[PDB]
Amino acid sequence: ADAPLAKASTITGFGRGTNDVHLTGMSRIAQAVIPAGTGTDGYIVVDETIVPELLPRLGFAARIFQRYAVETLEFEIQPMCPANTGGGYVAGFLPDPTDSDHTFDAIQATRGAVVAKWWESRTIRPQYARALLWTSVGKEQRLTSPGRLILLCVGNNTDVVNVSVLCRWSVRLSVPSLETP
Amino acid sequence: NDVHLTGMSRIAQAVIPAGTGTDGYIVVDETIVPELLPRLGFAARIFQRYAVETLEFEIQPMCPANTGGGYVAGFLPDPTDSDHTFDAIQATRGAVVAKWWESRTIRPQYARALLWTSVGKEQRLTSPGRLILLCVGNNTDVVNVSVLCRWSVRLSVPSLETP
Amino acid sequence: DVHLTGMSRIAQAVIPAGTGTDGYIVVDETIVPELLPRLGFAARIFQRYAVETLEFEIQPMCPANTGGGYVAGFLPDPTDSDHTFDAIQATRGAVVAKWWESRTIRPQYARALLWTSVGKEQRLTSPGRLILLCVGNNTDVVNVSVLCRWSVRLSVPSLETP
Amino acid sequence: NDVHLTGMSRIAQAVIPAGTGTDGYIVVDETIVPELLPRLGFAARIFQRYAVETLEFEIQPMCPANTGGGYVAGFLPDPTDSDHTFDAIQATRGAVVAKWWESRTIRPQYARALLWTSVGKEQRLTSPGRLILLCVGNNTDVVNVSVLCRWSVRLSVPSLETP
Amino acid sequence: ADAPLAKASTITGFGRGTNDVHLTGMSRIAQAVIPAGTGTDGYIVVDETIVPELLPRLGFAARIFQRYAVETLEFEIQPMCPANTGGGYVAGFLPDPTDSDHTFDAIQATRGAVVAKWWESRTIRPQYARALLWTSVGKEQRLTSPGRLILLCVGNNTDVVNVSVLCRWSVRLSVPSLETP
């Protein structure tokens, strides 16, 4: 063949990244310790929203993709103390990522909330939002985090309690990009 | 020529007084080199190249039932010199977590390559990973954990070291 | 993908009388592709070599009135600190003879797949060492000249400039 | 014993300023000896006798499309010292001719005998022909031609030269 | 269609000459005359190599092609004198194009050598090299000529003899070129 002024660019597959992944696992959320005597009713033990940062393997993989949709999400409380404590706790899951629910009556009211003594561990099967959210931060909180975990004591514990809440997540990140945190 | 050993052996043992051991306190962080296993330590002073077939761990802690803290353990197949946290042990396959009176079983995901026994300039060819056992609670009384192993390996290529 | 064979001298040393007591290391050189003169011009082509057979000879040269002796072996650790008698004796394919006696080493190689160029880790570029040390006390001037008998299957073509 | 090499390698490269290179101007005339091919040059320093199985050439010239001269090339299986003209290259089998921006492919007719590598008193036993690339036009701008090769050979009878 | 910077050269069949020819014929090689009395035993009458120059139609057609391979090659001696001569000759064909074989014993020894009186003509069916040679000259002679014809007298002839050797050749020139002699 003959010779033109400029041959066309033969970049064939450009911007054809992967689309759909499924990440699962289990990772803790937070952990605290309470001395004896402290921790009457209504004392907030842990209140941390489920942003993708607190799940550590997801937060290194949501810096690629744009949108995620939580398929299954369950929680395990696991306090650690012998059976001579005798206080208690209440655990729940509130799908508002707002900043004012600190009472026993709000947490007991939600779907799939548990209450037990400090020597017993329970399991939360919550009522999550099942929508399709965003990953990066913005002005509005209701599009980037599917709720909060609130755990607070209900009695007056005798010895030192030691709770360590966990999280069993599964998610379907999609729409590839890359941001800067 | 070619052998097939089994065994069961102490890796390490540590003791923790009361007050010590908040979350993230490393109790034992040691690589799986042949110098730590006792019966393989005498047998890898003979041969040169081994390849692990099956390898499993048990934690076996020993404390009264009024302790009320806990531990986490795992197996990281990077034998680097920097993973001291909870979240690196969270990610791995075959990790365990329980209270201080309870024994659990680590079923790891090893490399199944073919390694060396002696030391060298590169670390990745002489040890198929690390065991990390770190306390997650804040214990009440003195515990005494004693981690075990269960190793099966197929040593070959005869030589003799001078350590 | 080729297959090369040949035979090549590795090294040579001469030892006067009195010098060369027991444990005096006569020669110690790794099996790097630079030392074999036909393979040194053929490792400059390809990238990966995997040895099939590798045998040695010792062929020392002295009159029959010297009466010392030697020991020879093959260590598949290309490390940089091995100066002893016991590790050479206990390997597979080790020999012991007099300085006018010639033997033949049939060692236990690695049969892995290595790299030709030099690098930071020595365990992927040279599948062994050859250590030779005296065991008696020499009387006359000896002259050792070790050999090699290699066979290898170079592949994945390139061109280095060492 | 017996090998079979392939490859692809630069034979030669020349540069021509403007004004130079009328018809019949020899750009490159070099015999196909093992000293010119790079990868075979290291491999024919080992063995003694080779025999070419397939051997092809490409011209690959590099100039802007405003040059407007041209070249001719060929392959003469006499490795003599006198063929410097257009008409000897005309006769041969597998010759090419194009303008300076166009690459063409020489598919020659070689000897398929069994040759030697080193030098000798007779020239016909050590090189299976010559490549001749000579300009046929009278070019406008600076060209830069870079002829390639594509050799496949079956070296045998091991030795070692001292060049 | 549209107009580029330069249209490609449409030289289609370039360097596609003829490949295989078969030339035959008959042509003399050399001719001599011997006076009476001269020509004892061992006197060389004719010793000329079979280079393609001495065959005249082949030498004008081997200046094109590179390589030739002699398929059939026979010789005829044809002396010319009456039956009152009474000497003799010996003819042969030596596939060395060297330069030292001058005796009766070397010529009689080869395959297809003849010996007869001067009034009788014979025919040589020789043992040629049947290889594939070159046409142009070079340093080594053994690749460019398939042997020599040597004819020498064996008796002491009485009258003037007159021999005229010939050559029936057939050849398959190939691999086209053109040289300068």
CSV table of C-alpha atoms in Angstrom, one decimal, chain E:
chain,number,residue,atom,x,y,z
E,1,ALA,CA,-10.1,7.3,-5.1
E,2,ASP,CA,-8.1,10.0,-3.4
E,3,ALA,CA,-4.5,11.2,-3.6
E,4,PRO,CA,-1.6,10.2,-1.3
E,5,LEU,CA,1.9,11.5,-0.9
E,6,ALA,CA,3.4,8.8,-3.1
E,7,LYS,CA,1.9,5.8,-4.8
E,8,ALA,CA,3.7,2.5,-4.3
E,9,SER,CA,5.9,1.0,-7.0
E,10,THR,CA,4.0,-1.6,-9.1
E,11,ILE,CA,7.0,-3.5,-10.4
E,12,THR,CA,5.4,-7.0,-10.2
E,13,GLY,CA,7.7,-9.6,-11.6
E,14,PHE,CA,11.3,-8.4,-10.9
E,15,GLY,CA,14.1,-10.9,-10.9
E,16,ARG,CA,12.1,-13.9,-12.2
E,17,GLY,CA,14.4,-15.2,-14.8
E,18,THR,CA,14.6,-18.7,-16.3
E,19,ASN,CA,15.9,-21.4,-14.1
E,20,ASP,CA,16.6,-24.7,-15.9
E,21,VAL,CA,18.1,-25.3,-19.3
E,22,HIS,CA,19.5,-28.4,-21.0
E,23,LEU,CA,22.3,-27.9,-23.5
E,24,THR,CA,23.7,-30.7,-25.6
E,25,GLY,CA,25.8,-31.0,-28.7
E,26,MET,CA,29.3,-32.0,-29.8
E,27,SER,CA,32.4,-29.9,-30.1
E,28,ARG,CA,36.1,-30.6,-30.5
E,29,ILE,CA,38.6,-30.1,-27.7
E,30,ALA,CA,42.0,-29.8,-29.3
E,31,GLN,CA,44.0,-31.1,-32.3
E,32,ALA,CA,47.6,-31.7,-33.0
E,33,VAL,CA,50.0,-33.1,-35.7
E,34,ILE,CA,53.2,-35.1,-35.1
E,35,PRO,CA,56.0,-35.4,-37.7
E,36,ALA,CA,57.5,-38.7,-38.5
E,37,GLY,CA,60.1,-40.0,-36.0
E,38,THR,CA,58.9,-37.7,-33.2
E,39,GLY,CA,56.4,-39.2,-30.8
E,40,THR,CA,58.0,-42.0,-28.8
E,41,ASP,CA,56.3,-43.6,-25.8
E,42,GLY,CA,55.0,-41.1,-23.2
E,43,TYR,CA,55.1,-38.1,-25.6
E,44,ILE,CA,52.0,-36.0,-24.6
E,45,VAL,CA,49.9,-35.3,-27.6
E,46,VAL,CA,47.1,-33.3,-25.9
E,47,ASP,CA,46.4,-32.5,-22.3
E,48,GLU,CA,43.6,-29.9,-21.9
E,49,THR,CA,41.2,-29.7,-19.0
E,50,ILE,CA,37.4,-29.6,-19.5
E,51,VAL,CA,36.8,-26.1,-18.4
E,52,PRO,CA,33.5,-24.6,-19.9
E,53,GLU,CA,35.7,-22.3,-22.1
E,54,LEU,CA,36.9,-25.1,-24.4
E,55,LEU,CA,33.4,-26.1,-25.2
E,56,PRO,CA,32.4,-23.0,-27.3
E,57,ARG,CA,28.6,-22.9,-27.2
E,58,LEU,CA,28.5,-23.7,-23.5
E,59,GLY,CA,31.0,-21.0,-22.7
E,60,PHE,CA,28.8,-18.3,-24.2
E,61,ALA,CA,25.9,-19.7,-22.1
E,62,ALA,CA,27.7,-20.3,-18.9
E,63,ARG,CA,28.4,-16.6,-18.7
E,64,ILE,CA,24.8,-16.3,-17.7
E,65,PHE,CA,24.2,-19.2,-15.3
E,66,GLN,CA,26.1,-20.0,-12.1
E,67,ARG,CA,26.2,-23.7,-11.7
E,68,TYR,CA,26.3,-26.7,-14.1
E,69,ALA,CA,26.1,-30.4,-13.7
E,70,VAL,CA,27.3,-32.7,-16.5
E,71,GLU,CA,24.7,-35.4,-17.2
E,72,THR,CA,26.4,-37.3,-20.0
E,73,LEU,CA,29.8,-36.8,-21.4
E,74,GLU,CA,31.6,-39.0,-23.9
E,75,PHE,CA,34.7,-38.7,-26.1
E,76,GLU,CA,35.8,-39.8,-29.6
E,77,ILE,CA,39.4,-39.9,-30.7
E,78,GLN,CA,39.4,-40.2,-34.5
E,79,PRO,CA,43.0,-40.3,-35.8
E,80,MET,CA,43.5,-39.6,-39.5
E,81,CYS,CA,46.2,-41.6,-41.3
E,82,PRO,CA,46.3,-44.6,-43.6
E,83,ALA,CA,46.9,-48.2,-42.4
E,84,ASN,CA,50.7,-47.9,-43.0
E,85,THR,CA,51.5,-46.0,-39.8
E,86,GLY,CA,51.8,-48.7,-37.1
E,87,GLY,CA,52.4,-46.7,-34.0
E,88,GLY,CA,49.7,-46.3,-31.4
E,89,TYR,CA,48.1,-44.2,-28.7
E,90,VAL,CA,46.4,-44.4,-25.3
E,91,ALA,CA,43.5,-42.2,-24.2
E,92,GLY,CA,41.9,-41.8,-20.9
E,93,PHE,CA,40.1,-39.4,-18.6
E,94,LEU,CA,41.4,-38.3,-15.2
E,95,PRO,CA,39.0,-36.6,-12.8
E,96,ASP,CA,41.8,-34.7,-11.1
E,97,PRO,CA,42.3,-31.3,-12.7
E,98,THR,CA,45.8,-31.4,-11.2
E,99,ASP,CA,49.0,-30.9,-13.1
E,100,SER,CA,51.1,-34.1,-12.8
E,101,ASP,CA,50.1,-37.4,-14.5
E,102,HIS,CA,52.4,-38.0,-17.5
E,103,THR,CA,52.9,-41.8,-17.9
E,104,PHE,CA,51.2,-44.8,-19.5
E,105,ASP,CA,50.5,-46.4,-16.2
E,106,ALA,CA,48.3,-43.6,-14.9
E,107,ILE,CA,46.1,-43.4,-18.0
E,108,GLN,CA,45.6,-47.1,-18.5
E,109,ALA,CA,44.5,-47.5,-14.8
E,110,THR,CA,41.4,-45.3,-15.0
E,111,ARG,CA,38.0,-46.5,-15.8
E,112,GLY,CA,37.1,-46.4,-19.5
E,113,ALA,CA,40.5,-45.9,-21.0
E,114,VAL,CA,41.3,-47.1,-24.5
E,115,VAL,CA,44.4,-48.1,-26.5
E,116,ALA,CA,44.7,-48.7,-30.2
E,117,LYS,CA,46.8,-48.2,-33.4
E,118,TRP,CA,46.9,-44.9,-35.3
E,119,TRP,CA,44.6,-46.2,-38.0
E,120,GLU,CA,41.8,-47.0,-35.6
E,121,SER,CA,39.4,-44.8,-33.6
E,122,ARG,CA,37.9,-45.6,-30.2
E,123,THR,CA,35.4,-44.2,-27.7
E,124,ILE,CA,35.7,-43.2,-24.1
E,125,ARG,CA,32.9,-43.7,-21.6
E,126,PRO,CA,34.5,-42.1,-18.6
E,127,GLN,CA,33.9,-41.9,-14.9
E,128,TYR,CA,33.0,-38.3,-14.4
E,129,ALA,CA,32.3,-36.5,-11.1
E,130,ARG,CA,28.5,-36.2,-11.4
E,131,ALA,CA,28.4,-33.4,-8.8
E,132,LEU,CA,27.2,-29.8,-9.1
E,133,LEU,CA,30.1,-27.4,-9.9
E,134,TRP,CA,30.6,-23.7,-10.4
E,135,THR,CA,31.3,-21.7,-13.6
E,136,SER,CA,33.6,-18.8,-12.7
E,137,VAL,CA,37.2,-19.3,-11.9
E,138,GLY,CA,38.6,-19.2,-8.3
E,139,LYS,CA,41.5,-20.3,-6.2
E,140,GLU,CA,40.6,-24.0,-6.1
E,141,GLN,CA,40.4,-25.9,-9.4
E,142,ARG,CA,38.4,-28.9,-8.1
E,143,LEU,CA,35.1,-27.1,-8.1
E,144,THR,CA,35.1,-25.7,-11.6
E,145,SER,CA,36.3,-28.5,-14.0
E,146,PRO,CA,35.3,-32.2,-14.1
E,147,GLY,CA,38.7,-33.6,-15.0
E,148,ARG,CA,41.3,-33.6,-17.8
E,149,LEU,CA,41.7,-35.5,-21.1
E,150,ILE,CA,45.2,-36.9,-21.5
E,151,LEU,CA,46.2,-38.6,-24.8
E,152,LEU,CA,49.8,-39.8,-25.4
E,153,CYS,CA,51.6,-42.0,-28.0
E,154,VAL,CA,52.9,-45.4,-27.1
E,155,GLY,CA,54.9,-46.5,-30.1
E,156,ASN,CA,57.2,-45.0,-32.7
E,157,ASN,CA,55.0,-43.9,-35.6
E,158,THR,CA,56.3,-44.3,-39.2
E,159,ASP,CA,54.5,-41.6,-41.2
E,160,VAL,CA,52.8,-38.4,-40.1
E,161,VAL,CA,49.8,-39.0,-37.8
E,162,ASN,CA,47.0,-36.5,-37.3
E,163,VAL,CA,44.6,-37.0,-34.4
E,164,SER,CA,41.5,-34.8,-33.7
E,165,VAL,CA,39.8,-35.6,-30.4
E,166,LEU,CA,36.1,-34.6,-29.9
E,167,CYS,CA,33.6,-34.3,-27.1
E,168,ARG,CA,29.9,-35.1,-26.7
E,169,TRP,CA,28.6,-33.1,-23.8
E,170,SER,CA,25.2,-32.6,-22.1
E,171,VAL,CA,24.6,-30.2,-19.2
E,172,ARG,CA,21.9,-28.6,-17.0
E,173,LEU,CA,23.1,-24.9,-16.3
E,174,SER,CA,21.0,-23.2,-13.6
E,175,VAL,CA,20.9,-20.4,-10.9
E,176,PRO,CA,20.9,-17.3,-13.2
E,177,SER,CA,23.3,-14.4,-13.0
E,178,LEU,CA,25.8,-12.6,-15.3
E,179,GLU,CA,29.5,-12.4,-14.9
E,180,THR,CA,32.4,-10.6,-16.6
E,181,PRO,CA,35.1,-13.0,-17.9
